[PDB]
Amino acid sequence: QLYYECYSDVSVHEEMIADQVRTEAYRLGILKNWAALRGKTVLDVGAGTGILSIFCAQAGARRVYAVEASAIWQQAREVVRLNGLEDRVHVLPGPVETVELPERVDAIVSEWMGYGLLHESMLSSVLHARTKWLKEGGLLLPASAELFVAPISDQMLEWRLGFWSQVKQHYGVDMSCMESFATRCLMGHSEIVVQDLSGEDVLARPQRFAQLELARAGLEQELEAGVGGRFRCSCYGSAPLHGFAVWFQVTFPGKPLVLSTSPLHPATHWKQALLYLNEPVPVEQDTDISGEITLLPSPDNPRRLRILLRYKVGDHEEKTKDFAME
Amino acid sequence: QLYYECYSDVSVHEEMIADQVRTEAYRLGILKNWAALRGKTVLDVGAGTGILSIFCAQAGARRVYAVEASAIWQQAREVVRLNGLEDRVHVLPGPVETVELPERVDAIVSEWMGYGLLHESMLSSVLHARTKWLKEGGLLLPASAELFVAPISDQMLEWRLGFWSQVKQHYGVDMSCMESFATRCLMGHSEIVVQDLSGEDVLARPQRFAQLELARAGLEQELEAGVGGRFRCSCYGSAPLHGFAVWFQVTFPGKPLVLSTSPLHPATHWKQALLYLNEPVPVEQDTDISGEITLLPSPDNPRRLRILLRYKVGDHEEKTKDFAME
Ligand SMILES: [Mg+2]
Ligand SMILES: [Mg+2]
């Protein structure tokens, strides 16, 4: 009959496990590496409720170290025991940067990805653990990530902006002047917005603007300096351009299994990271759009994602907008 | 190209106007009082974007004073002008408690209702304005409110709690121990939760536990002391009892038009106010439930809704739970 403060805690973990695209991609990606994991030792970075660590045991791992800093580590220990794996899977509380493992490991598994790939992500902790605890020639799951961008005409946003001009049709009162107000409020800000889109929102072929091989020399320094690159595309047809969507995929080594968060693919809890222009720009078929996207740490907090956008639409002058996570 | 901070502002007003049940009930409720409003003066308390004030003009009012304290009053003035009513409808910024009208009024219209009827509601301001500005024999729209309660088995909550015991069926990992954790987090707190339900969630005949005639002597004092009353009901069948839902209706004088927020009726943006027990209680057909519900000001803030619940399920001892708005 006591009162507890853990609603967010359960909601977050519920969302992740109920994300079948995510959870089944990890289950299968781990099983696909059975030959490399059989009789070997694994470190799970940010193990949460422990389900990926148990998948590793089920793929044949001799021993798994499940490291989790948040309050939820306690529930992981109970889940391990319930599945009869308390002698194979060891739950260790606290950050992986200072945990003491009794041995180096053959593999690191982690669901480290955040909104826009790098918002409040565990990637820096995975790389720290790779340097400190992974044996030479050891395995990282997933092994790589790719970043994508596309111009968008967000159909839900279009409806919200146009709503005010439609009030007269429904109630006999003209409220069309509310449209400029709504545009300022919904687009005239510099926050990254997390929202799920579909193919109906995508205005040109998506462009890959970066590829991250997670084991590669120098990646820690690239993350600090900024990850990204240039892009170019041509519009499919006539629409209000609202800005750009950014998303990612990750790949599990083997034919490789890919977990995608594209709006063209099955929805996931990551959705997409939307970068709105200050106001809509009309485009037509074959309107050329080019630009550059850079994912950066925020200066107050390297864990909060910043995105610097440069973009040029048709014959308009190149523009810049500097975003930070909502 | 400047940045503005008004997302919440537009979202709130969008939600209200897009609530067709709400907006059409006010449009029709106002029109239904055409004979009383024709050639008369009206005060709109908390006029927001101004749409109800314009409805009053369209119902024949000679003059309407639209009083609004928040930033949105500016958009109301533009809406009035756009509909060509700047000489009939006057928008006045600031709280109605200190506004200076050039005359007393024949009627007060207001959409004052909050979540659980009284959370951050404008009712005290409507009653203040009634005392200060309404002529003798003057009209209030709506004229009355009624409060309802029913026991509930929240099907969405039931699914969330049971989710953890279903993980084994889908991924081959037992997580059933997460259920007690989820119950503590989702039910073991004393916050009122705003959530929309349907008939599938309602476990016994809804009970009216209070009626408020808005013009009645003594209502201001009743609001301070607490509004509510006792109830009794008998369960329809076998289910986990999760607690109680509270909702309201308001009535426009004329056959009277009723705007309801019942889960048995068309959904509205008010949804219902849910009062969860600390954990589910099993009930059966004809299980008797009795109790008392009181809606109160919070001590820090009379505008934040508090609800004191007393309840007795079957042969169990009577219990008390003291809730405050989330
Ligand atoms: Mg996550
Ligand atoms: Mg309201």
CATH of the domain at A172: 2.70.160.11
* Residue where a domain terminates, one of A95, A126, A142: A142
On whether both A123 and A151 belong to a single domain, the answer is no
Residue A175 Cα, gap to closest chain B Cα (Å): 6
Q: Strand pairing partners for A192?
A: A325
User: Rounded to whole angstroms, how far apart are CA atoms B235 and B152?
Assistant: 10
Q: Who among A173, A185, A190 is closest to B51 (CB)?
A: A173
On whether both A74 and A214 belong to a single domain, the answer is no
Kindly report the number of other CB atoms within 10 A of residue B260's CB atom. 19
A22 is in an annotated binding site: yes
On whether both B195 and B80 belong to a single domain, the answer is no
Q: CB–CB of B50/B111 below 8 Å?
A: no
| CB-CB under 8 Å, A27 with B188 | no
Q: CB–CB of A274/A202 below 8 Å?
A: no
On whether both B122 and B164 belong to a single domain, the answer is no
Ligand nearest to the CA of A270: 1
On whether both B200 and B311 belong to a single domain, the answer is yes
Q: Which two tokens stand for residue A295?
A: 């994912």
Per-residue CA distances from B198 to A33, A195, B7, B283 (Å): 47, 27, 30, 19
Q: CB–CB of B295/B118 below 8 Å?
A: yes
Q: Who among A10, A177, A182 is closest to B186 (CB)?
A: A10
| CB-CB under 8 Å, A14 with B55 | no
With an 8 Å Cβ cutoff, is A186 touching chain B? Answer: yes
Catalytic annotation, pick one of B15, B24, B78, B120: B120
* Residue where a domain terminates, one of A123, A142, A161: A142
With an 8 Å Cβ cutoff, is B27 touching chain A? Answer: yes
Q: CB–CB of B154/B288 below 8 Å?
A: no
Q: Strand pairing partners for B290?
A: B232, B312
Q: Which domain holds residue B65?
A: 1-142
User: How far is the centre of ligand 2, averaged over its atoms, from the C-alpha of B16 (Å)?
Assistant: 7
On whether both A124 and A165 belong to a single domain, the answer is no
User: Does the bond joining A297 to the residue before it have cis omega, within 30 degrees of 0?
Assistant: no
Give a three-class secondary structure readout of chain A.
CCCCCCHHHHHHHHHHHHCHHHHHHHHHHHHCCHHHHCCCEEEEECCCCCHHHHHHHHCCCCEEEEEECCCCHHHHHHHHHHCCCCCCEEEEECCCCCCCCCCCEEEEECCCCECCECCCCCHHHHHHHHHHHEEEEEEEECCEEEEEEEEECCHHHHHHHHHHHHHHHHHCCCCCCHHHHHHHHHHCCCEEEEECCCHHHECCCCEEEEEEECCCCCHHHHHHHCEEEEEEEECCCCEEEEEEEEEEEEEECCCCEEEECCCCCCCCCCCEEEEEEEEEEEECCCCEEEEEEEEEECCCCCCCEEEEEEEEECCCCCEEEEEEEC
With an 8 Å Cβ cutoff, is A75 touching chain B? Answer: yes
How many structural domains is chain A composed of?
2
On whether both B111 and B180 belong to a single domain, the answer is no
With an 8 Å Cβ cutoff, is B178 touching chain A? Answer: yes
On whether both A235 and A255 belong to a single domain, the answer is yes
| CB-CB under 8 Å, B27 with A171 | yes
Q: Which residue of A has its CA nearest to B278?
A: A1
On whether both B66 and B152 belong to a single domain, the answer is no
Residue B28 Cα, gap to closest chain A Cα (Å): 10
Sheet holding B134-141, edge to edge: B89-93, B63-68, B41-45, B105-109, B134-141
Ligand nearest to the CA of A122: 1
User: Does the bond joining A142 to the residue before it have cis omega, within 30 degrees of 0?
Assistant: yes
Q: DSSP label at B25?
A: H
Q: Strand pairing partners for B117?
A: B114
Q: Resolution of this PDB entry, in A?
A: 1.6
On whether both B93 and B195 belong to a single domain, the answer is no
User: Rounded to whole angstroms, how far apart are CA atoms B171 and A236?
Assistant: 40
On whether both A63 and A169 belong to a single domain, the answer is no
* Residue where a domain terminates, one of B92, B116, B142: B142
| CB-CB under 8 Å, B185 with A4 | yes
Return all residues near B205 (Cβ < 8 A) that are at least 6 apart.
B150, B233, B234
Residue A58 Cα, gap to closest chain B Cα (Å): 9
Size of interface A-B (CB pairs under 8 A): 124
User: Rounded to whole angstroms, how far apart are CA atoms A172 and A159?
Assistant: 19
Write out the H or E segment, with its range, that includes residue B161: helix B155-171
CATH at residue A19: 3.40.50.150
This structure was determined by X-ray
On whether both B134 and B198 belong to a single domain, the answer is no
Angle made by CA atoms B212, B73, B32, in degrees to the nearest 5? 45
User: Rounded to whole angstroms, how far apart are CA atoms A126 and A114?
Assistant: 13
